[PDB]
């Protein structure tokens, strides 16, 4: 059961969020955010720049000073705050899911049942880690007592993409706040709305001023300012091609001949088409064993043709528009390159509507490794199907590219052989895009997400006489 | 490639080991240990009883006193001591492997390449854990610094069986010593020799006096004395349900084994499943806590499986353990010898189809022919009671849902042979056993849980000036 | 800031709780629960016996069956349920603190600010552990993939004492539920009410029927039935958590004012009814006289009276049996030669009130220095050296404390003291995250006792690092 | 008890070590390494450059290929090899200690009892970690079995300094090899000999060819080549994944209630150890005003009695500085101290006409703004500053973060300072106490050292009905 959406949700937040207050850009400039479904402007948004970032960083630094409310607060209480934030987001679940759809373009049913559900689960998961990340007491040689303490890194710069606005924000705030860091976040110009509203909930939840600061704006400006600021202790970027870069692209989905055909077909479809193909780990290279190639391809094309493209607020809609005009044209050019390179266009291939950034679900057959559409990730509804013969062969082709991969088979040995040989951060077996707030995700979440937001301090004390 | 064995190894240790010295029993009494291959006495061994145990526990307690060499020793050094012990055992590998065979009966080739090898790997694995089991610093509410220390439990009474004399000794000494505990060990009357020789190596390795004490003797005497001693902090028993009850009656842990299910699905690799099922049951003369004594086979492959299993059992070479061709030695002693025979009789009486073997394999020693019973039923005695002998039980089943219930209706171990991913995961999750093997059996590895049982957690919570994250 | 209490709270739950439903005993018998402050009956409570426990164990077993809602539920959801139960308890905080005081006797201010606060923290802490207790993937030799899974033990029998009725219930429920077990709980006959009301909240929270079952009654019957039941997987009273004679050591360099107030707290907290009461106060000779004098004055000013009065520091003892037992112990203290410094008798004609009592010049051989009476009776012993106090303190191991300004003395004592918990310059400082034991409770360690480890070892193609 | 050293150790290894073989530089160039005690050339050593580095990376990559002996080897066996290497170093301990002294200058007694002892303990410590670094099985939502594997990162570039040649080599090899990585190591031009001999022991121990490769040479060339190589997966510098391990100006705080005798001796050790060439040297000795005069008087007398001379002499406490460049830099800093107004209490000049010997130097009443109080010189130059309160000292000590120390008998003061000091390691009543088990950073050593040498792979499998 999904509640009826408000197809025209009101925008309450569209400025810079610093010290639990809303500010206009220092330059007073503002940029428009567009509804991808119509191509029309939703509203104006404050355009943050270097000077705005500097204000945010100063606020963050102040909120991180020894003796401050955030620093003195019990670890268990940071957990309480994250749980409270989660409760507030659930309260406004319907409103947030609709706003997400309005600004991003993804189907409202998905925004509500998937995006929001995962946001809630992420924050509540991290709330639980707040007071459970232990240091150690170490049995060092000599008459000493040695132990470690896991301290926060400090001011963390977070730049999040537009594909999953709310979930990306939660993935970043969850682990950072659980460990006691302060944040200066930059949201995507294409999808700044929902994150700004969450900022309002962060204040309502009771987080001290300056703990979380959000600076909407442009990449070359605000984004770069955060990455270059001398008082930022850590910067985590997630998007297109302490510092951590989280990029995604060309994930191989391997279908063995003994795989369940119906399941394989639906999963490979999902693996690529999910969220308009706008996923860092989209299974954009579907490797199919020769014995089942023809049948698999036939079923895949049939599924792609039946995929409903339309108004994201319509319950029947499976695919909304692409995020913006730039991606829209980028995907169209990519489809043309596929045709020019000799890939067999099986269906789709063009615009799906005269209004908005809609593209027909496209499928290319007989794709080769050397082709552009087999090497470049375009984050669009364009499926690439490649044929292969042996398991040894596919391993090499799949690895010749490492965020994620998948293998569909009923054979135990094949599953274990492939899961070990595939060089990817996450390897799915008979499923795809299965993330858990508790399962790590990286390239070549969970408790591992905490390591990156913590600094280790070792204290070694001379004692009278050590005894086991 | 295995060195030529001294079929008649000299015995250097046969007394009570306390404070790195050899002592005769207080009573001066001694018991004989027999070579199961000939039925002849190997030598006399000091018979420890309550008073001997009391001396051992006193020595152990003294070595565990605060400020003692063992207590003050760096954790990394406990690791060095364990590594030195392993080096010495390896130096005397050929000798020990032969002594093990002589006293226990297992094939020398196995004693050398399996038993010793695992003893070495176990001690070396644990040596590495000595300085790596950390306590925690805890983010408690308020202005407090709270942390935990994992201290040793103290005096640990360890009673080990006769099936894997040396390995059981390593499995107990490894985790206990790595964590800084002291030990009072009671070895099996049927196999006391190897453990006593290792005691000599423990002394040579440099372990302080009283850290490890070994009292050979009888179960209801020495064994019960350890379990009932008021100054023993922990007692771990590994063996038959029969003596376990006595110990339970006399921190306590009872490690028993029996009737482990080996499930063969229709899609299993036939050649592999047959050889593995054979190994699963027959390994170590069937004297294994997790012996696959219930081989469930899906109906569509039952006939073929049984045929191949019977052929394999008939070809199993029984004979002198010191002969390189020997696959199966004798049973550990006369009591088990007759107990197994009675069990085979019961199988016949109950309607089980005797497919091969079923009787004595030699006029000298405790050798029994590899026996296989077909069409076994859940209600039969040979399908409910574990006899630790070379007697295989093959049961037929139809569905996977069915076999789960039947396998669980008994939980040390279990195995599944199948090429199907979903079938492997379904069974590994559904089978209620401590260890579930998939397409393999008896695959143990020295490889943290064993450490928890050997440590005490102490929390220290200190008031401090204002706390900050 | 404590809301005014309802000094005579309504009782909504007084029956056996099985499968989210209220049941009368099969015998239909009931027993009275008394208000220790007046000696009068509060209400009748269903007297569960063996047959009632049997119904509870079966309901638990059913709830634990593979494929059941509690077994199939995502680990994260068990956490959501724990968090919802905490929210409900917080909603009914004022009411529950009053009921706890009515039935147990402790001051309402403490019930509210201490017991209820700790209950909330305990449940919320454990809610966080539900989906974070990982198994391991092990690098075994050979071409094998080996891993472990932490499964619930099953039906857990839990016997809760009367000293901290609500807190002990939370300490037992938190880890057990976070790990997916089912429970059959036996509450103390002296204090059954608060736990039964929490059962109602357990049902309201959404826990499946049979996950938590509560059987009020007596120890020799209901308690023994749980302990002997063949279908109960684990019983926690096998693990026995007992407490007694915890040493509180005051070094000559301690902060005098702080040590005096803390030693007073250490012993008198909860009418001295605490498993780790600092009932042996060891004081170094150079400060003994002054420490004793200040301790005596503090004991004399301790306000004893109606626990609902804001000024009350000490309520009555839990029941008449304890009341008499403590009085007999005070008499033995005088007979054996301990110096009675203050108190020593009954504090009121109604209720089980005892005057705060302090004994000086206590010797290790005395009965009052060896037997724990769980009462408002302080023992002050004198010592000379740090080496001496260690031996005396250890000659008894749930807890201990040291008061000193010296780093080395503090580290030497915290290591040498054979106690499960050692406090330095504080006392009774518990955290839902810090372990406690003489098995272990609280923290991550509390999860170990409620889990079975299953190893799965799979043969795989060709293993690579 | 230390054996008699060979004051003229023979050199057996002086080339590039690749695939368990000794190679001359492609250019055939060599550079002389000097004995800092005499200023004379010990021998010539192959001068590796980009081309030699490329060969080592290729050998390392090959040894890391799936299916190779190093990749297939049981984890426990990597541990056996590390223990064998340790046994071989122990066999050649007397020789190694003398060669360390000949090339670096530190007292032979220290090389034998300290450096070599720590090298042995470090390798033996990591040998034990080889098969104990577990992944996890995660309780994810839904009918899925999710687990992680900790895989090696791959080709690790390791650049080690000259202050502790052998120990630094072991700190890098231990964790890298225990977790199955392969190495391309660049040793310091000032001290390449001991590491090259160890490579010979690595071969003798049985490590597969290409697992460890060592390229002696210069920083701007060989080092830069490793850091910039496209096929190097991680680079660790001490002096792709990158980690810079730098050190400097660690504060040693002496409270008025400290044990005077122990504090004076430890402060002396804290600064003067290893000719002052230690990243965490206690180069800022803060002394509480009530004990200042006496502490200084004692420190001066202790510095004046410190024996400087031939490092092979058993009475020698201080050998020469590592090279001419450091010698001059220290003389420059001493002059800077005098010109700045710091009170020169003793030393301050050249201690011998041959070699690079400097007199133990003590500056008194140093103030925070002085250059000698802000820059690290890695020399036998002690700075003593005066302070009044604990709140004051915290701020002064922090205004600079690898290490710090506090000497006091008071529990609260020790906890206050160990909490407040922003340093990776805080020692209480001791200094320079390292354990192979305790982490060190500004991480290395302990369990923490393994995290940087491993990649986390998550495998998530769809399974029939899941149950707890
Ligand atoms: Na938009
Ligand atoms: Na024998
Ligand atoms: Na009552
Ligand atoms: Na040199």
């Amino acid at each position: 059961a999904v509640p009826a959406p408000n197809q025209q949700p009101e925008v309450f937040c569209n400025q810079i969020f610093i010290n639990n207050e809303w500010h206009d850009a220092v330059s007073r400039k503002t940029f428009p955010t567009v509804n991808p479904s119509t191509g029309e402007v939703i509203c104006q948004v404050a355009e943050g720049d270097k000077e705005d970032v500097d204000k945010a960083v100063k606020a963050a630094r102040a909120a991180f000073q020894l003796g401050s409310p955030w620093r003195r607060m019990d670890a268990s209480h940071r957990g309480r705050l994250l749980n409270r934030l989660a409760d507030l987001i659930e309260r406004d679940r319907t409103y947030l899911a609709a706003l997400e759809t309005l600004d991003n373009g993804k189907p409202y049913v998905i925004s509500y049942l998937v995006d929001l559900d995962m946001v809630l689960k992420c924050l509540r998961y991290y709330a639980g880690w707040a007071d459970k990340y232990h240091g150690k007491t170490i049995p060092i040689d000599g008459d000493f007592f040695s132990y470690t303490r896991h301290e926060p890194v400090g001011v963390c710069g977070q730049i999040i993409p537009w594909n999953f606005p709310l979930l990306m924000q939660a993935w970043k705030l969850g682990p950072a706040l659980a460990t006691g860091n302060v944040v200066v976040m930059k949201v995507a110009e294409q999808t700044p709305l929902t994150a700004l509203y969450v900022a309002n909930l962060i204040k309502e939840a009771g987080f001290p001023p300056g703990v979380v600061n959000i600076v909407p704006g442009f990449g070359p400006t605000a984004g770069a300012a955060i990455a270059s600021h001398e008082d930022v202790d850590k910067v985590a970027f997630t998007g297109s091609t302490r510092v951590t870069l989280e990029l995604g692209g060309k994930s191989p989905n391997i279908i063995m001949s003994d795989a369940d055909m119906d399941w394989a077909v639906e999963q490979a479809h999902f693996a690529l088409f999910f969220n308009q193909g706008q996923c860092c780990c989209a299974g954009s290279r579907t490797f199919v064993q020769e014995d089942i190639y023809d049948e698999f391809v036939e079923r895949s094309v049939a599924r792609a043709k039946s995929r409903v493209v339309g108004n994201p607020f319509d319950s029947k809609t499976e695919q909304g528009p692409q995020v913006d005009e730039t991606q829209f044209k980028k995907i169209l050019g990519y489809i043309n390159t596929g045709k020019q390179e000799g890939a067999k266009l099986l269906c789709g291939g063009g615009i799906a509507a005269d209004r908005g950034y809609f593209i027909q679900p496209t499928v290319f057959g007989d794709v080769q490794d050397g082709m552009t559409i087999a090497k470049e990730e375009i984050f669009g509804p364009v499926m690439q199907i490649l044929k292969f013969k042996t398991i040894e062969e596919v391993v090499g082709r799949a690895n010749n590219s490492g965020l994620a991969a998948a293998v569909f088979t009923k054979d135990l040995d094949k599953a274990n052989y492939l899961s070990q040989a595939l060089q990817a951060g996450t390897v799915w077996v008979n499923c795809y895009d299965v993330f858990g707030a508790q399962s790590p995700f990286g390239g070549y979440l969970g408790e591992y997400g905490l390591q990156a937001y913590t600094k280790v301090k070792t204290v070694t004390v001379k004692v009278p006489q050590k005894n086991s």
Side-chain angles (χ1 to χ4, degrees), chain A:
Chain A
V2 183
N6 176 335
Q7 303 192 212
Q8 285 271 54
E10 183 179 14
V11 183
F12 303 91
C13 306
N14 67 353
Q15 301 173 89
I16 310 297
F17 189 84
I18 298 172
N19 273 333
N20 286 184
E21 303 181 310
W22 293 107
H23 308 240
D24 267 350
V26 167
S27 76
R28 314 212 87 269
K29 285 186 186 175
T30 176
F31 68 88
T33 178
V34 177
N35 177 338
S37 292
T38 63
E40 300 187 343
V41 173
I42 299 180
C43 63
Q44 223 53 38
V45 186
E47 187 182 340
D49 217 299
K50 183 179 173 177
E51 292 179 35
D52 301 286
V53 166
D54 190 60
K55 286 168 59 191
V57 177
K58 290 191 184 300
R61 175 62 52 190
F64 190 72
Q65 291 308 297
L66 300 133
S68 80
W70 189 235
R71 295 302 298 287
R72 279 198 51 50
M73 182 181 297
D74 291 330
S76 63
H77 197 67
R78 293 195 309 260
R80 295 300 302 128
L81 296 176
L82 286 167
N83 273 321
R84 174 57 166 157
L85 175 59
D87 285 345
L88 292 169
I89 285 169
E90 183 160 11
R91 183 194 62 192
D92 305 348
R93 193 176 169 175
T94 302
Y95 166 74
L96 275 163
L99 180 52
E100 190 79 322
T101 290
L102 193 77
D103 208 17
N104 169 283
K106 70 180 70 201
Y108 166 77
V109 167
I110 302 302
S111 274
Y112 186 94
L113 290 178
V114 177
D115 291 59
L116 269 294
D117 184 55
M118 292 190 298
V119 164
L120 293 176
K121 290 178 172 177
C122 178
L123 293 184
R124 287 173 182 149
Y125 172 75
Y126 276 111
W129 270 122
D131 55 2
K132 297 172 187 62
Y133 199 40
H134 309 115
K136 307 168 189 300
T137 59
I138 305 180
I140 203 182
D141 294 343
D143 295 308
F144 301 101
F145 167 38
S146 181
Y147 61 89
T148 60
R149 257 151 38 70
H150 290 169
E151 315 187 333
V153 161
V155 180
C156 307
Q158 310 180 309
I159 299 148
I160 55 182
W162 44 257
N163 50 357
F164 298 88
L166 284 171
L167 186 59
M168 284 303 97
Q169 177 183 220
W171 277 14
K172 290 283 169 288
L173 291 183
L177 299 181
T179 55
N181 294 280
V182 282
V183 165
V184 172
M185 180 175 270
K186 188 290 188 66
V187 292
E189 54 190 283
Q190 299 96 159
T191 51
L193 299 185
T194 51
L196 287 173
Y197 184 72
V198 171
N200 232 22
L201 299 183
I202 287 177
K203 176 190 179 179
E204 188 181 348
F207 282 88
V211 168
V212 173
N213 307 282
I214 304 193
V215 179
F218 298 137
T221 53
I226 296 182
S228 66
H229 203 296
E230 287 204 291
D231 203 39
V232 172
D233 302 282
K234 173 189 192 293
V235 52
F237 169 83
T238 309
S240 305
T241 304
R242 225 181 286 198
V243 181
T244 65
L245 290 183
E246 297 157 70
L247 327 171
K250 244 50 199 185
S251 298
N253 185 190
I254 308 172
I255 317 310
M256 304 303 281
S257 59
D258 59 4
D260 180 299
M261 184 60 66
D262 297 339
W263 188 234
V265 178
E266 189 52 66
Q267 290 303 296
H269 176 73
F270 175 71
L272 180 131
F273 293 101
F274 181 61
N275 198 51
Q276 294 68 234
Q278 296 164 151
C279 182
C280 62
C281 53
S284 56
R285 279 191 302 152
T286 318
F287 287 94
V288 183
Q289 217 168 10
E290 56 177 26
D291 294 344
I292 62 172
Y293 182 89
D294 296 326
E295 189 185 351
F296 181 94
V297 174
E298 187 168 351
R299 295 160 182 282
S300 294
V301 171
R303 186 66 180 81
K305 284 179 174 179
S306 69
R307 190 182 179 75
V308 181
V309 183
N311 183 340
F313 282 115
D314 197 302
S315 66
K316 291 178 177 179
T317 300
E318 288 194 76
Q319 177 178 319
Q322 306 304 124
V323 164
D324 61 359
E325 188 182 277
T326 306
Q327 285 301 305
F328 184 66
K329 291 185 300 186
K330 214 161 180 278
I331 295 168
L332 297 172
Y334 171 96
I335 297 176
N336 236 86
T337 298
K339 306 161 88 171
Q340 262 123 253
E341 293 178 330
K344 194 176 170 191
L345 179 63
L346 307 174
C347 67
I351 294 184
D354 45 295
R355 187 176 180 60
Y357 310 122
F358 304 84
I359 294 176
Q360 298 173 322
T362 303
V363 178
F364 278 104
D366 297 308
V367 174
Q368 306 303 345
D369 300 342
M371 298 178 166
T372 283
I373 65 175
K375 301 188 304 174
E376 180 190 306
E377 173 66 63
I378 41 83
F379 301 108
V382 182
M383 174 170 90
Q384 285 71 216
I385 316 178
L386 313 88
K387 182 189 303 186
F388 77 96
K389 189 180 169 302
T390 70
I391 187 173
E392 297 78 13
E393 168 197 16
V394 73
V395 166
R397 313 228 273 137
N399 286 348
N400 195 11
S401 183
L403 185 59
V407 174
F408 284 68
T409 176
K410 289 181 190 170
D411 191 67
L412 177 72
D413 286 7
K414 288 176 197 172
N416 291 331
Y417 174 90
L418 280 171
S419 66
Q420 183 183 257
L422 295 169
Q423 291 169 39
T426 298
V427 172
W428 291 296
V429 176
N430 294 330
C431 60
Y432 206 95
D433 285 340
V434 184
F435 302 91
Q438 47 290 272
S439 291
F441 184 66
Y444 277 23
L445 294 174
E447 181 173 358
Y448 300 92
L450 300 177
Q451 304 182 340
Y453 284 97
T454 279
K455 229 193 301 186
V456 179
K457 172 194 284 176
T458 295
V459 181
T460 293
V461 181
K462 170 192 172 65
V463 301
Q465 180 191 83
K466 182 199 63 191
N467 277 277
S468 61

